[PDB]
Subunit: 308 residues, 2 copies
C-alpha cells in the first residue's frame, strides 16, 4: 500500500456533522437517490468528509452547499440506466446542461430538466452568490473543461477504447478529467476572498494548478488500483512491459516528481508577488489561494486513506 | 431615419478585398451555403465589410479568420430546415456544441458534426492561437453566455412568446443576445495584445462593455425596425402606449443616454489605471482595449448605414 508523506498540515471543518445531516436530507429532497440501497451506497463514499477536509474554512451553511455540490459530480453517472443503448448520448446531453447553467443568470431553469440539472441550477445560485464576474467566468470555464473531458471518458468506454491511451496522452487527459481546477476555484467562494486576477494568470500559479491536478489524479489512480486499463498503473505497465510492482513504483515516482515541482513553485510565490508589484493585502489573498490548493492535495489524500 | 453622430474616428482594414475573396470561397468549401441563391443572399449582408470596420488592425490572414467567424453566427439560424417540428431543439443541440468547442483542446473534433460545428472547430483553433489561458477562458464564457441567450430567443419565438417582454426585461435580455462581449474580446486576438486582467475585472471596464453592448443592441433594433414585437421600438410603444414616432424618439434617447454614460467612463480610464498602479506598457494595452470597444460601436454603426 503506497503511502505519501506530504509536507502540509491542514485544517478540517468543525461543521462536518451539522452539514452532513442537512446534506443527506437534501439528496433525498432533490431526488438524487431513489432507494434506500442507493442511499446507503452513496453514504459509504463519505463525501461529506472530503468536503470538510477540502473546504475547511466554510461557514456552516456554505459547508452544506459544498457537500451538496460535491454529491452532484459523484452521483452524475448513477443518474442514468446503465444498460440503455444510447447511455453515452444522454450523459453528453445532461453534462452540457450542467455546462451552460453557469453561463445563464442565476435562478434560471434548465432546459433539460432532470433531478441532477435542477439540483445544479439550485447549487450554482448559492455557489456564485457574492462572487465577481471574473471568478464566475473562471469557474465556469474550469467546470466546463472538466465536464467535456468527462464526456470524452464516457465515450472512450462506450466505444470499447479503454486501454488505448499511452502514457503521455493518458497523463494529459487525466489532468483534464480529475476536475481539480474548478475545485480550487471554489476555495475562494468557501472562504470569502478572490485571488488577484494578475496572479491567477501568472505562469507560476497556472502551473501550480496543473501540478496539483496531476498529483491528485495520480494519487487517486494509485488508490483505486490497489482496490481492484484506464489507470496510471495499468498504463505504465503496458507502456514499459514491466511488473505490476515496477509499474506501482513508477506511478509513485511520477507523483512525487509532480509534488516536488509543485513545492518548488510554492517557494517562488513571494518572487511572483514582487514581479507583479502586489501590495500586502493582495499578497495575503495570494497566500490564501495557495492554501486552497494545499487543502485539496492534503485533504484528498487524508480522505482517501479512510476508504469510500 | 435615425442617424447618430458618434465622437469616434475609426480605421478600416486595408484587407477587405483580399480577405473577402478567400472568405467567400471558404463558405462554400465548408458547406455553410448550399445553393447559388443562398450564397447571393449571404453576400448581400456584406459581413466582410463589418469585419473590416470592427477589427481594423488585423493582419491579412487573420482578417480572413475573422470574416469566417463572423459568418458562423449569422449563418447559424439558416443551417436548419425552418419548417421541421423540433427546430428549436436541434438549434440548442448545435449551439451547445459551439459552446463546448472552446472548452476542449484546439483541433479536437466536435461530437455533433455538421457544417457549422466543423467550421467552428477550425476557426477556434486559429482564433485561440497565441492567446493566453486567461483570454481563452474569458472568450469562452462571453461566447457561451451569448449562445445560451440565443437559444432563449429561439425558444421564446417557437413558444409563441414574442412580444411578452416588458421594457426592463427586454433591455437586460438584449444586452445578452447582442453578443458584443465576445466581439470585443476578439479585438485582442486581432491586434495582438491582451488587456491587463486586473483592468478587465475593474468596475469601470466591466460597465463599459455592458454599455457598449446596450448601445449597439439598441442601434441595431432602431435600424432593423426602420426596415419592416421583439424590438426595442415595439417594446417601448407597448410599455408607454405612445405613437410609433414617440417610441422611436424614446429608443433614440435611451441609446444616447447609454452612449453618454459610456463616454463618461471612457474619461475615467486614466484614473482607473492610477488606482490599479499600472505601468506605462500596461496603460498602453488598456488604451488598445478601449479602442477595440470604439471599433465595435463605430464600425457597427457605419456598416449599418450601408444596408445588408
Ligand atoms: Cl475553505
Ligand atoms: Cl466537484
Ligand atoms: Cl498503448
Ligand atoms: Cl478578496
Ligand atoms: Cl483590430
Ligand atoms: Cl460574431
Ligand atoms: Cl408587456
Ligand atoms: Cl499584450
Amino acid at each position: 500500500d503506497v503511502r505519501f508523506d506530504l509536507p502540509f498540515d491542514t485544517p478540517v471543518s468543525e461543521h462536518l456533522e451539522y452539514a452532513r445531516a442537512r446534506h443527506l436530507r437534501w439528496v433525498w429532497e432533490m431526488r438524487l437517490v431513489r432507494s434506500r440501497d442507493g442511499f446507503e451506497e452513496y453514504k459509504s463514499w463519505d463525501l461529506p468528509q472530503a468536503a470538510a477536509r477540502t473546504y475547511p474554512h466554510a461557514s456552516a451553511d456554505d459547508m452544506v452547499v459544498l457537500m451538496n455540490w460535491f454529491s452532484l459530480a459523484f452521483l452524475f453517472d448513477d443518474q442514468f440506466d446503465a444498460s440503455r443503448p444510447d447511455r453515452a448520448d444522454r450523459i453528453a446531453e445532461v453534462a452540457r446542461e450542467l455546462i451552460v447553467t453557469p453561463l445563464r443568470p442565476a435562478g434560471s431553469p434548465p432546459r433539460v430538466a432532470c433531478p441532477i440539472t435542477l439540483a445544479w441550477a439550485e447549487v450554482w445560485k448559492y455557489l456564485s452568490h457574492g462572487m465577481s464576474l471574473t471568478w464566475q467566468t473562471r469557474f465556469a470555464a474550469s467546470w466546463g473543461r472538466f465536464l467535456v473531458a468527462h464526456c470524452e471518458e464516457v465515450d472512450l468506454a462506450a466505444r470499447g477504447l479503454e486501454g488505448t491511451l499511452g502514457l503521455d496522452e493518458y497523463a494529459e487527459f487525466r489532468r483534464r478529467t480529475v476536475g481539480i481546477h474548478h475545485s480550487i476555484d471554489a476555495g475562494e467562494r468557501s472562504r470569502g476572498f478572490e485571488v488577484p486576477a494578475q496572479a491567477m494568470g501568472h505562469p507560476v500559479m497556472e502551473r501550480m494548478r496543473d501540478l496539483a491536478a496531476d498529483t491528485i489524479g495520480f494519487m487517486n489512480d494509485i488508490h483505486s488500483f490497489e482496490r481492484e486499463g484506464h489507470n496510471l498503473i495499468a498504463v505504465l505497465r503496458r507502456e514499459r512491459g514491466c511488473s505490476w510492482q515496477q509499474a506501482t513504483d513508477e506511478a509513485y515516482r511520477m507523483t512525487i516528481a509532480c509534488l516536488d515541482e509543485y513545492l518548488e513553485l510554492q517557494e517562488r510565490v513571494p518572487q511572483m508577488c514582487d514581479e507583479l508589484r502586489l501590495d500586502e493585502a493582495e499578497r495575503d489573498r495570494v497566500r490564501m489561494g495557495v492554501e486552497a490548493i494545499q487543502h485539496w492535495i492534503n485533504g484528498n489524500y487524508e480522505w482517501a486513506l479512510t476508504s469510500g
